Amino acid sequence: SKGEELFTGVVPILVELDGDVNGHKFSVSGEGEGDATYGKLTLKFICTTGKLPVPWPTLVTTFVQCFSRYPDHMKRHDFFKSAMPEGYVQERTISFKDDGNYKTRAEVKFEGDTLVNRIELKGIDFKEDGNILGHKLEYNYNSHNVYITADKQKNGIKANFKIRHNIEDGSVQLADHYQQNTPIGDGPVLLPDNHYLSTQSALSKDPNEKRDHMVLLQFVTAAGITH
Ligand SMILES: [Mg+2]
Ligand SMILES: [Mg+2]
């Protein structure tokens, strides 16, 4: 298909986010590459405004599910690649249990041969010394299942999942995710049967990088459909 064919090799990625969380305004730029053949992502993000005012882990899901590996027998269920190159809008509400929420609106599309994710993020209702604004979350990341369903009147998809952020005291900060995706272009997209994406992520630091930053290595496989 046109869209899937754009992902058979290594594709460079750019991420650009502007955020406002409880009036703390910040921006992040990221770069790296994806290899959807292996479900593989490598990205490095820089906060360009100084110190990031929320913990890096809380932004991982916001910072390109077209790089998930869809098994061959599941090709017909890959909405994300089918919207390319024109792209899709991706919107979420991320509800941090007993704390505030993020609302995000992003557009994921090609600019030339580069896959771009441009995001606007708004966070409200955060506690000044909760786990987010108080920076109480460990610098690590768990493995999740992203449950996808068709959203036929939008010509797109929805997703619902729970992200678990470990807290430095050993507890966990839940971040409920609700997601909607809508194609931007006029080409045919794929409306999938129910399925999920199996995720795993590893966070690290670049020892020579003195700006506030995050290095992310991520592997994602679509699953839940046998034939
Ligand atoms: Mg720049
Ligand atoms: Mg079917």
Author numbering: 2 to 64, 68 to 231
Recite the paper's sentences.
Green fluorescent protein (GFP), which was discovered in the jellyfish Aequorea victoria, is a light-emitting protein consisting of 238 amino acids. GFP absorbs UV–blue light and emits green light. The structure consists of an 11-stranded β-barrel plugged by a chromophore [Fig. 1(a)]. The chromophore is 4-(p-hydroxybenzylidene)imidazolin-5-one, which is formed from three intrinsic residues (Ser65, Tyr66 and Gly67) in the polypeptide chain by a post-translational cyclization, dehydration and oxidation.
